[PDB]
Design a protein around this ligand. Structure first.
Ligand SMILES: Nc1ncnc2c1ncn2[C@@H]1O[C@H](CSCC[C@H](N)C(=O)O)[C@@H](O)[C@H]1O
Ligand SMILES: Nc1ncnc2c1ncn2[C@@H]1O[C@H](CSCC[C@H](N)C(=O)O)[C@@H](O)[C@H]1O
Lengths: 194, 285, 285, 182
DNA sequence: CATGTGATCTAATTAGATCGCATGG
DNA sequence: CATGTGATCTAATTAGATCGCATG
């Protein structure tokens, strides 16, 4: 389902955030009004299905690898498995007709073995997003169509490899590139302003 | 009033096809037995001992969602993922998220893929097995990904060997009391070949390593044969596990190749107890 | 009339008790079966596969005439002495008078010790087996010491393997034409496990070494399995020799220890053909 | 009184000279090559009261292993035994000239159903013989050990080949069963 | 306070290649 | 002249001992 919404019938998006609070990203693009709609989960090792359900319905489920650093209490594959687990907890009942999106972003922390586990569990190969003025890059998995149809500067995973290894060795988030992946969602939900 | 249909089974990490063996032993008709397995010795055992009925699909990680819908539907999904990175007998275990431990999530993944959609109430049963001697953190995570708590079934109650195993699943009466059937050999002596005397009533947990056949940290020999100590023979190991005698006498396998197959597998009477109430849900005799 | 009685057998170099097996397959009642054998593997097979019926007496050279008098009388004396120093397949064969070749004279000696004295017309039968591929002089000396010529019986006529063997003895109709039983497996394909394809009708002579399992000087594999070449499994060797399947799945024996026992033994259908007329002389079930 | 002349079949060595020293259509039969001698051959060579066989001494003229002479000796001996209805006495004779090794020696005792008596000669060498006659095993003789006979066997290979000085001392107490020419 | 769906050491076996030639087909 | 109830040598694989310590 890749159908558009008329502007007058677009509701505010309900977002479930795991391993990152992307408030500042989503506010900066007019997805939330600045009142007192996004649930951030501290640690997912004990949240069951009833928890994701009682947190109200969700229109977008976001999870991301932490950037290159020591906040790896967990192995890099733990964030992916846990994201997939609660993603199924957050899927709408097969009768509901509203739009539903999910996305998982990798800051070049997963190695080759964790990357094939990534594309097999989420059932799509990653779209790698580069930052030119050659700074940083991210690979993303998501059902968002304009992240699969639009064409950013293609990069060899070997070019990414040199960077990746070099960046990992060099040892926050690339806000500019994660922000760009949210923009095609403005055509599906309510937009807010300043 | 609808007559029951033969069962269609998806068996991941099949091993030596204990699942199909127990189903046939119960008289349950089997329309499809699809097994993902990668060890050629195990595939040869299953191919031979079931006359090409099993259909092999290879690495569990090669099995996609599209494969599940082509080959499905499935009425029963069974499996026990490798535990060499889970069991605390290995001081070098890499955990649930590394090594072979992460192959558990392939089971959770294909189980999600094979589940009937919400609203479809056709009979669907699943069972996941692993060791009790695993890390507390790894058992918690297994239960959360499967959204069920396991039941502990020790093979010692219906066989001649200790084998405390965890079983996650939804099979009917999974937590009902264990019944010592007349077909069960409860003591080691009943599994020994002629002319040999057991030194223990029950034998300790049999791994794939030879040191598990000897008893305790003092490595006591299990049996006597004309006053000389001896380990268990392969046929005796099979009888301890509940397999037909010479079940694994296949493909010129060494003793240790046979024990590797048996040490990783299920206690047959335990699976028969778990599969038993399935015969009231599928075609029989 | 006078009713026939169970048979009493002295079996020298008994091996894996082919003699007792064939007698039981023929329904002949066996009062006692005394076996001289030294190989602990061979003794364990016989002890297990015949529930301690065989009485073992050990080295053939420790059996005196006094023992023959105490343990006898015997109605049947059978044996096939070691041929590793007799068969031309060993370029280091020490001949009939050295190495293990001289163990033939122990059969000649005990055959003399057990014969009925002149005037005693009680039925007495004996059989001595050995290879055709021996030297002219050695075969000549064997026939002079047993005072009769052998008959050449190739197991290829009743089995899936070449095995041209000499048989000395006085059994009824040792020269009668060899007929194919309908339970004989004449082609290699009939002896293979499921899912495997034979590349030959009959295989060459199986010895104790695995190069005899491959065919020709080119050492061709005998079997295809899913388009991969393979040698015979042990159960397939047993079927080729005519033994019950898993007959030698005993005592944690390796493929090599099992092929050593089979490579030295008799072709079961041949012995059945040779023993069959004994049914008219002794009590049968 | 009624003592008929003796009939002696010799194997692997003609005893004519030593037994004519006791005077014992010749009564003797000497066999060329036993390998093709069957039962009907020994049977048609008339009855025999004593059968004799011997190893060759340390030296050549022997293309056979030392064990060949015994097995053939044991074979044709039972060819020559008489039916139990025969009242005439029957005796056999096999003597070794130090060629038998240990492994070969036990084959002798087991196949002939008795261990050998050791007979020396000191001034030469020694011999050992198996036989049912009651005059060697019963009558006590010079008892030595097989180990000093081993030094005399190494002393045999040292020097070189004949045993007949002591061989004649064996066939002697047989004249009380056959004729005697003095 | 025993215990283990293993693994890493070793020294012991095993699998495959190779050698062998008198024999009766 | 293809064959063989074997034997030797050499990498390969098994036994068998020992090592581990979190957990129930
Ligand atoms: N990637 C993979 N895909 C499929 N099977 C695998 C695999 N990795 C390991 N396995 C298999 O998973 C099995 C786990 S042992 C379980 C066997 C089964 N319980 C029985 O009764 O026989 C092993 O046989 C192993 O060979
Ligand atoms: N000194 C001895 N005393 C008794 N048996 C012996 C022996 N030396 C070797 N043997 C045995 O003689 C056998 C010769 S192979 C014959 C086996 C038999 N025909 C069968 O059908 O199985 C071998 O099993 C060997 O172990």
């Amino acid at each position: 389902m890749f159908e558009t919404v008329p502007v007058w019938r677009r509701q505010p998006v309900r977002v479930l955030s795991l391993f990152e609070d992307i408030k500042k990203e989503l506010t900066s693009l007019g997805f939330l009004e600045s009142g007192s709609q996004l649930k951030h989960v501290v640690d997912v090792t004990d949240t069951v299905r009833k928890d994701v359900e009682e947190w109200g319905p969700f229109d977008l489920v976001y999870g991301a690898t932490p950037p290159l650093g020591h906040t790896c209490d967990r192995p890099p594959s733990w964030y992916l498995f846990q994201f997939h687990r609660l993603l199924q907890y957050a899927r709408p009942k097969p009768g509901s007709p509203r739009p539903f999106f999910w996305m998982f972003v990798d800051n070049l922390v997963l190695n080759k073995e964790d990357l094939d586990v990534a594309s097999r569990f989420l059932e799509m190969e990653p779209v790698t997003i580069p930052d030119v003025h050659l700074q940083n890059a991210v690979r993303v998995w998501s059902n968002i169509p304009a992240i699969r149809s639009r064409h950013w500067a293609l990069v060899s995973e070997e070019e990414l490899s040199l960077l990746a290894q070099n960046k990992q060795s060099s040892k926050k988030w690339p806000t500019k590139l994660v922000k760009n992946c949210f923009l095609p969602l403005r055509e599906y939900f309510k937009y807010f302003s300043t | 009033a609808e007559k029951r249909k033969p069962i269609r089974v998806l068996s991941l990490f099949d091993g030596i096809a204990t699942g199909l063996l127990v189903l046939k032993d119960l008289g349950i008709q089997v329309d499809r037995y699809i097994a993902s397995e990668v060890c050629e010795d195990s595939i040869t055992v299953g191919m031979v001992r079931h006359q090409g009925k099993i259909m092999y699909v290879g690495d569990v990680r090669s099995v996609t969602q599209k494969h599940i819908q082509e080959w499905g539907p499935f009425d029963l999904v069974i499996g026990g993922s490798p535990c060499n990175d889970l069991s605390i007998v290995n001081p070098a275990r890499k955990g649930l998220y590394e090594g072979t431990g992460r192959l558990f999530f392939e089971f959770y993944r294909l189980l999600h893929d094979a589940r009937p959609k919400e609203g479809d109430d056709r009979p669907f049963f699943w069972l996941f097995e692993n060791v009790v001697a695993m890390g507390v953190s790894d058992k918690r995570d297994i239960s959360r990904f499967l959204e069920s708590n396991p039941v502990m079934i020790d093979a010692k109650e219906v066989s001649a060997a200790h084998r405390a195993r965890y079983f996650w699943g939804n099979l009917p009466g999974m937590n009902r009391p264990l019944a010592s059937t007349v077909n069960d050999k409860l003591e080691l002596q009943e599994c020994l070949e002629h002319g040999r005397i057991a030194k223990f009533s029950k034998v300790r947990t049999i791994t794939t390593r030879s040191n598990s056949i000897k008893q305790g940290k003092d490595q006591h020999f299990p049996v006597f044969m004309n006053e000389k100590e001896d380990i268990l023979w392969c046929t005796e190991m099979e009888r301890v596990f509940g397999f037909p005698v010479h079940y694994t006498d296949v493909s010129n396998m060494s003793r240790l190749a046979r024990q590797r197959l048996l040490g990783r597998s299920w206690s047959v009477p335990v699976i028969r107890h778990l599969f038993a109430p399935l015969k009231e849900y599928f075609a029989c005799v």
